[PDB]
Amino acid sequence: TQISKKKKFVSDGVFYAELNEMLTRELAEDGYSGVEVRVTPMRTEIIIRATRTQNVLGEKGRRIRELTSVVQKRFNFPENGVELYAEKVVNRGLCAIAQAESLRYKLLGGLAVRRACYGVLRFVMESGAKGCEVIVSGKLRAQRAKSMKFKDGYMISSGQPVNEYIDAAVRHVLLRQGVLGIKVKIMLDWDPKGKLGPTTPLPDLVTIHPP
């Protein structure tokens, strides 16, 4: 019954990594962006961030209860010791996973890649990202594979501020000719309130108060 503090934090990390994988495979076409585990004393509340928050809930919340019971039995929680919520992703344009999946379904249907990638770019920039980049790699038109980059705006690539300012995702499209790769990198703007983007300004950015 006694579990080390090391074994426990590794177990929480592995549980998070597995939950998100099964939700990514299950709530795929619901716009699943991410999951926020929150272990409260009574229950381990689990918040799901998605775009179709009526498709994950289901008819009278049947799907969400099915997922809540599957998580309880599979992960071995105490009964009523886990409750899966489902919130709304505030800004879908500023999420690279939401746009990666949107571009996935915009290509599974059959739309031309050069027209859906620029559409994703358009939506991201109207959403407010300081810069966005899309990469499409695979057998796009011919048998030889090539990589088409779709960059617009300002994008940093090196240093620590990358893992604060760059929201990125990597998704496959399972097409008839093979697998198509999608790398979406969205560069966020500095939000003083820390909602739309980082709260810490970029290190090189200097502001001089006017006299």
Partner 1 sequence: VQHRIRITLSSKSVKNLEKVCSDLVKGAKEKQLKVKGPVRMPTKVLNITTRKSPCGEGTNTWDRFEMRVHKRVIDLVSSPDVVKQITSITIEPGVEVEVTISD
Partner 2 sequence: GHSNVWNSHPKNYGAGSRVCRVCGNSHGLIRKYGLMCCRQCFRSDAKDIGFIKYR
Partner 3 sequence: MIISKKNRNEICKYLFQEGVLYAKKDYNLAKHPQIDVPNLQVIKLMQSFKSKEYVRETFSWQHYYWYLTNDGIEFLRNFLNLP
Partner RNA sequence: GGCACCACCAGGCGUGGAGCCUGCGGCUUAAUUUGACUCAACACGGGGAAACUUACCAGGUCCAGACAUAGCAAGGAUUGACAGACUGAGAGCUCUUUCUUGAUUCUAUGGGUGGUGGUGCAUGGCCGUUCUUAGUUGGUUAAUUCCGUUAACGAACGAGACCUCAGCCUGCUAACUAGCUAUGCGGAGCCAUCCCUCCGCAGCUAGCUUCUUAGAGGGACUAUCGCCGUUUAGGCGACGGAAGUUUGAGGCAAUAACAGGUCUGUGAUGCCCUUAGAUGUUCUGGGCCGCACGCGCGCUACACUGAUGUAUUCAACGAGUAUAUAGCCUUGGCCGACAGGCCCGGGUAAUCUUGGGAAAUUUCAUCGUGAUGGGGAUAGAUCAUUGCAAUUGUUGGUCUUCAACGAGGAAUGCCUAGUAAGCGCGAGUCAUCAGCUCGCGUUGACUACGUCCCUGCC
Nearer to partner 2 by Cβ, of 143 and 163: the residue is 163
Q: Could you say which residues in the range 2-41 bind partner 2, by CB under 8 A?
A: 6-7, 9-14, 16-18, 20-21
Nearer to partner 1 by Cβ, of 39 and 179: the residue is 39
**Could you say whether residue 37 binds partner 1 (CB under 8 A)?**
yes
Rounded Cα–Cα distance for residues 91 and 83 (Å):
24
Specify the 3-state DSSP secondary structure of 6: helix
Nearer to RNA by Cβ, of 108 and 170: the residue is 170
- Choose among partner 3, partner 1, RNA, none what residue 149 binds, the Cβ cut-off being 5 to 8 Å by kind: RNA
Backbone angles phi, psi at 7, to 5 degrees: -60, -30
**Could you say whether residue 9 binds partner 1 (CB under 8 A)?**
yes
**Could you say whether residue 111 binds RNA (CB under 7 A)?**
no
Measured from the CB of residue 51, what is the shortest distance to RNA in angstroms? Answer: 22
Of 139, 162, 137, 134, the C-alpha closest to 149 is 134
Residue 176: in which H helix or E strand, if any? Answer: none
**Could you say whether residue 1 binds RNA (CB under 7 A)?**
yes
Considering only the C-alpha atoms of the chain, give the largest distance between any 2 of them, rounded to a whole number of Å.
65
Which residues 6+ apart lie within 8 Å of 199 measured at CB? 190, 191, 192, 193
Q: Total binding residues for partner 2 by CB under 8 A?
A: 13
- Choose among partner 1, partner 3, partner 2, none what residue 26 binds, the Cβ cut-off being 5 to 8 Å by kind: partner 3
Here the contacts of 136-142 (C-beta below 8 Å, separation 24 or greater) are 136/180, 136/181, 136/182, 137/180, 137/181, 137/183, 138/173, 138/175, 138/177, 138/178, 138/179, 138/180, 138/181, 139/175, 139/177, 139/178, 139/180, 140/113, 140/180
Among 70, 90, 148, 179, binds partner 3 (CB under 8 A): 70
Give the footprint of partner 3 on this chain (CB under 8 A).
Answer: 18, 21-22, 25-26, 66, 69-70, 73-74
Give the footprint of RNA on this chain (CB under 7 A).
Answer: 1-7, 135, 137-139, 143-145, 147, 149, 154-162, 170, 172, 174, 176-183, 202-204
